[PDB]
Design an enzyme around this catalytic site. Sequence first.
Site, PDB file in Angstrom:
ATOM      1  NE  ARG A  15      -2.977   0.160   3.235  1.00 45.30           N
ATOM      2  CZ  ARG A  15      -3.018  -0.761   4.192  1.00 45.30           C
ATOM      3  NH1 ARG A  15      -2.047  -0.820   5.094  1.00 45.30           N
ATOM      4  NH2 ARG A  15      -4.028  -1.622   4.248  1.00 45.30           N
ATOM      5  CD  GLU A  77     -12.864  -7.988  -4.720  1.00 46.06           C
ATOM      6  OE1 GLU A  77     -12.814  -6.787  -5.052  1.00 46.06           O
ATOM      7  OE2 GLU A  77     -13.891  -8.689  -4.877  1.00 46.06           O
TER       8      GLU A  77
END
Lengths: 168, 170
Positions: A15, A77
């Site tokens: 991130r 996902e």
Amino acid sequence: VEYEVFLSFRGPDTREQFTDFLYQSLRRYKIHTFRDDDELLKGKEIGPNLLRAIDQSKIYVPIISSGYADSKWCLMELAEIVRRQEEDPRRIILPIFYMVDPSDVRHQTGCYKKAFRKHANKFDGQTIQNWKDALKKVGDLKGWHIGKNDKQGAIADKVSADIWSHIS
Amino acid sequence: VEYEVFLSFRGPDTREQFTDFLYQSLRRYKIHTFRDDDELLKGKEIGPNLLRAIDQSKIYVPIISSGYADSKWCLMELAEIVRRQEEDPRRIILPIFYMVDPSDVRHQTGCYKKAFRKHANKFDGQTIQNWKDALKKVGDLKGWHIGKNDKQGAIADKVSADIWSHISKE
Ligand SMILES: [Co+2]
């Protein structure tokens, strides 16, 4: 307004590094990009952002790091990313192998073994299998490896330029 | 009857490994493929094959192994391939990183250091630099890595299919 690029990543791994650098570069091109952070997404984002982004994006970028299979959201996902591409082969999946050997992503070995051992305590065989099939599928696609000696900003620039030129 | 795929590789490194398997898979699709082997070319083949293939092929596959930069022929050909795709970006380059860190191809470090040290004995800076820029350009493209634990036949098959899709969409 309409989403163009969908970033799938393991929050705690990337991130702050590559994922953010790639996000920034895509914005410089005014590419509408969604960040599928497995930890920080908000409830009012599910519909208005997540589903719409995954619906509209014609390019998916799975940034696959060593902790990616530890997260059930990531696996869920990826599987969905794979399914949607299979339905509409005009969609493109662009994997980034972040500091992992693509072999481990392809066979779910190494750092991924223990993730799947763990998940198999809670999920059935078909769910586990669907998750492994997605990593194999995506691990076998052309993409970019990122290693300890790479200048991640340069790769981000290469990836975003490639994406921008395609989007035309 | 035009060439469709141009394989660039270091013979002693991959001739008997991934390069051959990709050639076999491509051949199963009946995809017309040139093998740019840095040792085994013949002179009657420079015109009606090599140059025809580098001209006609719209997909170039540089299989970049640890000995790739040792061969001036490989470096020269990569620079040409890179020049041809810039001149006509409908063409694509599909790098295979065969048992090397992409890092090293990208920065010409590790195994590639001494190779460039050696070429610098015979070639000027501009020539060396054009070769380095080719490796960097290609090293920064999306591609496939092959490692010691990979099943190379599986990868050859996936590369073949990708190549086949692209040829067909045209
Ligand atoms: Co044919």
